[PDB]
Amino acid sequence: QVLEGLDAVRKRPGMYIGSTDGAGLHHLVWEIVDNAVDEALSGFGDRIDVTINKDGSLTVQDHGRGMPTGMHAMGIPTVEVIFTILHAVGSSVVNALSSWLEVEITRDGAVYKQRFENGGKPVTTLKKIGTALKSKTGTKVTFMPDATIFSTTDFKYNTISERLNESAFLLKNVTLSLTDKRTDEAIEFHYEN
Numbered sequence: 001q002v003l004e005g006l007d008a009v010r011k012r013p014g015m016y017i018g019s020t021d022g023a024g025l026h027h028l029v030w031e032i033v034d035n036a037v038d039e040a041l042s043g044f045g046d047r048i049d050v051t052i053n054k055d056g057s058l059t060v061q062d063h064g065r066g067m068p069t070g071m072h073a074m075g076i077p078t079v080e081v082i083f084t085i086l087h088a089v090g091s092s093v094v095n096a097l098s099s100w101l102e103v104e105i106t107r108d109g110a111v112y113k114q115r116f117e118n119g120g121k122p123v124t125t126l127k128k129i130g131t132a133l134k135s136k137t138g139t140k141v142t143f144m145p146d147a148t149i150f151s152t153t154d155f156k157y158n159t160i161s162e163r164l165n166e167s168a169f170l171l172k173n174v175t176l177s178l179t180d181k182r183t184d185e186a187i188e189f190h191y192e193n
């Protein structure tokens with residue numbers, strides 16, 4: 001396995017997300033949502049909340065275990081390695097094709113955050129920003145797709161709604177929600193079994 005930096009994704013985005021049109025834009029959403037879904041499939045977290053923010057960014061929040069908060073080699077946070085090294089893998093690809101991205105992790109009574117800008121360059125380390133109840137766990141990822149890469153940066157409520165509905169049906173017993181702050185639209189899906 002040859003590891004690569006995020007420049008490899010930015011120079012050949014179609015290789016990783018298929019295209020740079022609306023289909024490619026939404027593949028970014030699928031990658032972030034699918035990580036939360038995978039956690040829930042393993043029994044960690046029973047709701048996944050997606051928000052299309054007023055500024056055009058998108059947030060996915062889950063209540064899974066929380067991504068690793070520890071260190072890799074050289075005092076580099078494990079989360080930074082996940083978001084900045086291409087193991088060519090979804091997280092790093094989204095970061096590469098975003099003008100900014102924030103990851104917030106809650107676990108063990110602490111809330112941590114790291115911010116990346118301009119195609120995934122870290123502008124902070126993983127820093128403790130606050131506290132929470134010891135029971136509270138989860139990951140929140142917010143990203144702004146890079147307008148210099150995509151021909152459209154407009155997330156489509158109906159497209160995302162449909163995908164989240166399908167994911168809720170396949171998962172069972174997990175609530176998926178979508179809120180659009182541009183229009184105030186909102187919906188929730190949950191299938192009991």
Ligand SMILES: O=C(O)CCc1cccc(-c2cnc3[nH]ccc3c2)c1
Nearest residue numbers: 035036039062064065066067068139
């Ligand atoms: O605490 C441990 O030992 C396991 C940690 C642990 C191990 C593997 C995966 C996760 C994890 C969790 N939430 C996530 N949300 C999106 C991706 C993602 C990954 C957390």
